[PDB]
Every structure is written in structure tokens, then in C-alpha cells.
């Protein structure tokens, strides 16, 4: 019963955030980079994450 209450107070804190762009990956490259075309925007080379 207590666990659930702790879940609620946490949630309020996190919520101030800043979002993520949607893109589509054109193709992956072995520099451990990806070329992406963002939809209203341009295309970029971006560095993959850890996971």
C-alpha cells in the first residue's frame, strides 16, 4: 500500500521534460553513426546510444 503512494510523489517531479524528434533511419553506417532524415527538418548523422 505504501509502495503505490511513493510512486505517485515521484511522478510529479519527473514531468518537467523536453521531448524527442521523430525521424526515419535511411541507413546505418559503420562509424557507429546513423543517417536520419527528420520529417519537417533536415538530415543529420547521429551517434548511436549504448543499449
Amino acid at each position: 500500500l505504501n509502495a503505490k503512494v511513493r510512486l505517485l510523489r515521484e511522478e510529479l517531479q519527473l514531468l518537467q521534460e523536453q521531448g524527442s524528434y521523430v525521424g526515419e533511419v535511411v541507413r546505418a553506417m559503420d562509424k557507429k553513426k546513423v543517417l536520419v532524415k527528420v520529417h519537417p527538418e533536415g538530415k543529420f548523422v547521429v551517434d548511436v546510444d549504448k543499449n
Binding site: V26, R27, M29, L35, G42, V45
Partner: protein
Amino acid sequence: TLEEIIDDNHAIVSTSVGSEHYVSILSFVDKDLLEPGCSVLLNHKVHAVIGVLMDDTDPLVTVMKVEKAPQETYADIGGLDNQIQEIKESVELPLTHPEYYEEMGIKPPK
């Protein structure tokens, strides 16, 4: 994209970002691999050249397939023989023989 190549250590660039910054090129990438109208990488606030983009599109030209060494041979048709010598002498023969073209001094037909 690099618009055009201004050889007195300049170039024209069109940015869809905002800022541009005239920089010295890195030593991995040179200007001898830069061609006019080429795509290149710029930073989004110091707008400098990391590398040239290595991702190029499909030949957009009219219908073509390129093929290295097709399956078929010319031993299957027969009795046509003379025509077969004619293409032989023109196309195949100079590849086979450099020095026969040197003696005569001329090219087999284009």
C-alpha cells in the same frame, strides 16, 4: 552543401541552418575530394567540416543494368560463323593484343 569552389581559400556555402564559419579543413578530408555542389557535414553552431558525406544515391539515368560476365556463350548458335568473326576482330582482339594495335598504329572501330 558546398555551393561552389572559390580557389583563393574561400568557397560558397548555402546553409539551411543559420550561422556559417570559415574554417580550415581537417587533414583526413581534403579539397581534392570536394567537388562543386557536394554534400558535406557541418556542425550546427560552429559549422565546420568533419568529413564529406559518403552516402550517394542510385544512378537516376534511363533503364540500365550492369553485368559482369553473363552466363551464355556463342557456341550454341551455328552456321552464322562469318558475322561472329567480324565482332571478334573489332571488340575482343585489341584487349587480347596490345602490340598488334601498336604496329599498325590505329584503333579497331569504336
